[PDB]
Design a protein around this ligand. Structure first.
Ligand SMILES: Nc1ncnc2c1ncn2[C@@H]1O[C@H](COP(=O)(O)OP(=O)(O)OP(=O)(O)O)[C@@H](O)[C@H]1O
Ligand SMILES: Nc1ncnc2c1ncn2[C@@H]1O[C@H](COP(=O)(O)OP(=O)(O)OP(=O)(O)O)[C@@H](O)[C@H]1O
Ligand SMILES: Nc1ncnc2c1ncn2[C@@H]1O[C@H](COP(=O)(O)OP(=O)(O)OP(=O)(O)O)[C@@H](O)[C@H]1O
Ligand SMILES: [Zn+2]
Ligand SMILES: [Zn+2]
Ligand SMILES: [Zn+2]
Lengths: 460, 165, 53, 29
């Protein structure tokens, strides 16, 4: 409607650094393709970027610029097809439907197996179907619905993500696609192979919830340390089993129950001793001594038995076992620290230049205004898209220089720790003051020269 | 102390649900294979044993109660197999897996989350106290700036930049 | 005590790694100083202030 | 205040230079 509003919408301003190292401002019309970028992809890129050793995220953004352009092209192509776009828009809804159906099937299986908001309405309908037809028919209907809904969800996922644009090898490489395929296979097995298979779909909950995923990460982040601690515990149990087999063989007596003798020697063979220890002592709070025969005070070896039990309890159980829990707690602390650091850097520094918010205070332009307008990353992405799109013959001075920089694989044109508004105004003021001082000095020198000329003329 | 738990209650509940899912899978495995060994002694008010795994739901309930309440795990209540039994190695493997996954790792996640919540609360309290007691409420200026100057930071807040003024 | 020892070891390792990878070995100058200058910090350590030299 | 003192000194120097130039012009005339 308003020409000025339309032109302002399509106009983007950026700050760049030339070879001379003097900052410059480029105002350009945003390419039409750039508008097609989805905001979900923008948020994912903003939150996913990882700073390099230099402390700048610009390299990853530049690398992902090409993928973003391809995503824009694929989004336009998808817009060309209303039905595929509509399916893509509802991918989350399909995923939720599939998860809810799997949960309902699992609940029914758990409640009645073996056999033979709208969510309350769905539950009532499921109960009515169970009563009218039975558990078998209702489970079959729910399984078929879940399989079809998950297939639709996967179709929408592949359509929306555009991962096929990367290539079929990329499709196979994407872990999420393989996980969805595995979910579909599990649903298929549940529908036909056996109902209990649907229980596996419960693991999908981990993918759905992020807090549970973080709790699991707390363990899997340092899984190698936990496994090594378990191996050390196994080695200690092996040594202790050797000691018991050599010396305490008799005391290894375990009560036994036989299906249609009440005790057995569970340490006849050193391997059997190791197995018995590794099972009972690890499962026993006191240790191996809990299951081993209780020695009387009269027994000569009773002090040795007490020493052995105390050593086992203090080493294998008290210390070694607690190492896994300590490692898990330390992993929790490390994850919390990393998350806090990442959030602070993201929300308190400029993405492009890395400048802190503290610098922009007490100045004409605030930090928020700086990021919103002066140093918007998407403006730089749009400039890159324009440079690629624009013909070389039509390249403007700064545009030609930036295209040459892109060809040279150099990111110097990206500003680093430099902002126009923060330093340029003060520098201009200082330069004006210095120029005034220089003009005064030049006037004084001219007056001195005139006086010298007058003196020379008088002498002559 | 209560906040330390309620602050991240969602994570604790999700960990409990994950433990329930693991117990459900393990109950499925036992019902399919280890159905016989699920024998529990019973006391009757005025048989001394019962099969607590006749139905998969009953197996799930029995595991979720006894194994979670048992330090060793489900294997503590399950019938003890003799070395002669063919399935004894399978029973030992099942018990070890249960103890190492459901009890050793998954259960400790709740305690780790509680400890991490304690640490987060302590850090937040320290940051808030430091900001309150070392910076100006109105202008946010630090106390370090006002030292070596005519007007001290305390005088600045008391008179120059009093919020109530 | 074991948990506190874990935390202390993690803190010491983080501090040592940060100092090693963000400061000059010879002069101790931080990487932040060399930015916005003709010679970068990495170039400084590689050529200007190489310990092996 | 320091900058104002410096500016006053510069203005006095400029006034002296202008007076010298005027005297030279008068002598030439
Ligand atoms: N260089 C940057 N540093 C930090 N945050 C940035 C930077 N560039 C953009 N952001 C933030 O990323 C998000 C993307 O901003 P964007 O300009 O896309 O906003 P928008 O409201 O979708 O756009 P518009 O209203 O101008 O059509 C916003 O939170 C913006 O503050
Ligand atoms: N801007 C500020 N920044 C930090 N602390 C402040 C600020 N303004 C007030 N305070 C503190 O808040 C409390 C309120 O101070 P206030 O002037 O009300 O003191 P008062 O002793 O009750 O008053 P009075 O003695 O002047 O009648 C004091 O601790 C004061 O130091
Ligand atoms: N003063 C220093 N501060 C920090 N790191 C340094 C310093 N001097 C050297 N390094 C690093 O220590 C390692 C040793 O560098 P060195 O010069 O030996 O490299 P090189 O590749 O083996 O040698 P060249 O390629 O020159 O034959 C490199 O990582 C270098 O960056
Ligand atoms: Zn910036
Ligand atoms: Zn103040
Ligand atoms: Zn150096």
């Amino acid at each position: 409607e308003d020409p000025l509003a339309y032109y302002e919408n399509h106009t983007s301003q950026i700050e760049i650094v030339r070879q001379d190292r003097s900052m410059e401002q480029i105002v350009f019309p945003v390419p039409g393709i750039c508008q097609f970028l989805t905001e979900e992809t923008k948020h994912r890129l903003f939150t996913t970027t990882e700073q390099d050793e230099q402390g700048s995220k610009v390299s990853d953004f530049f690398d992902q610029s090409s993928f973003l352009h391809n995503e824009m092209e694929w989004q336009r192509k998808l817009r060309s097809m209303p039905l595929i776009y509509w399916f893509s828009r509802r991918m989350t809804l399909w995923g939720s439907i599939s998860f809810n159906l799997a949960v309902f099937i699992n609940i029914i299986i758990a409640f009645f197996y073996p056999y033979m908001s709208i969510r309350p309405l769905i539950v009532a309908l499921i109960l009515r179907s169970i009563y009218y037809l039975g558990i078998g028919p209702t489970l079959n209907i729910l399984g078929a619905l879940n399989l079809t809904n998950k297939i639709v969800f996967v179709v929408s996922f592949v359509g929306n993500r555009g991962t096929f644009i990367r290539g079929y090898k990329a499709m196979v490489m994407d872990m999420e696609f393989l996980y969805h395929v595995g979910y579909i296979l599990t649903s298929v097995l549940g529908l036909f192979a056996h109902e209990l298979f649907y229980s596996i779909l419960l693991f999908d909950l981990i993918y759905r919830e992020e807090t549970l995923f973080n709790v699991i990460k707390s363990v899997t982040r340092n899984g190698r340390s936990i496994l090594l601690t378990a191996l050390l515990a196994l080695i200690l149990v092996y040594l202790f089993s050797i000691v018991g087999f050599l010396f305490l063989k008799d005391d290894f007596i375990l009560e036994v129950d036989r299906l249609p003798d009440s005790t057995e020697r569970a340490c006849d063979t050193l391997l059997m001793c190791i197995v018995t220890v590794m099972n009972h002592g690890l499962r026993n709070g006191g240790g191996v001594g809990d299951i081993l025969r209780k020695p009387s005070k009269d027994e000569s070896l009773f002090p040795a038995r007490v020493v052995y039990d105390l050593l086992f309890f203090f080493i294998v159980i008290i210390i070694v076992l607690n190492l896994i829990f300590g490692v898990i707690i330390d992993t929790f602390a490390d994850l919390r620290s990393e998350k806090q650091k990442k959030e602070e850097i993201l929300k308190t520094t400029c993405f492009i230049c890395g400048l802190e918010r503290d610098k922009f205070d007490n100045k004409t332009v605030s930090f928020e205004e700086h990021i919103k307008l002066e140093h918007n990353m998407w403006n730089y992405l749009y400039f890159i898209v324009l440079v690629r799109v624009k013909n070389k013959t039509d390249y403007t001075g700064p545009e030609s220089y930036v295209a040459q920089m892109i060809k040279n694989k150099n990111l110097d044109w990206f500003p680093r720790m430099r902002a126009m508004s923060l330093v340029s105004n003060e520098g201009e003021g200082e330069q004006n003051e210095i120029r005034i001082l220089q003009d005064k000095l030049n006037s004084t020198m001219k007056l001195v020269s005139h006086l010298t000329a007058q003196l020379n003329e008088l002498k002559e």
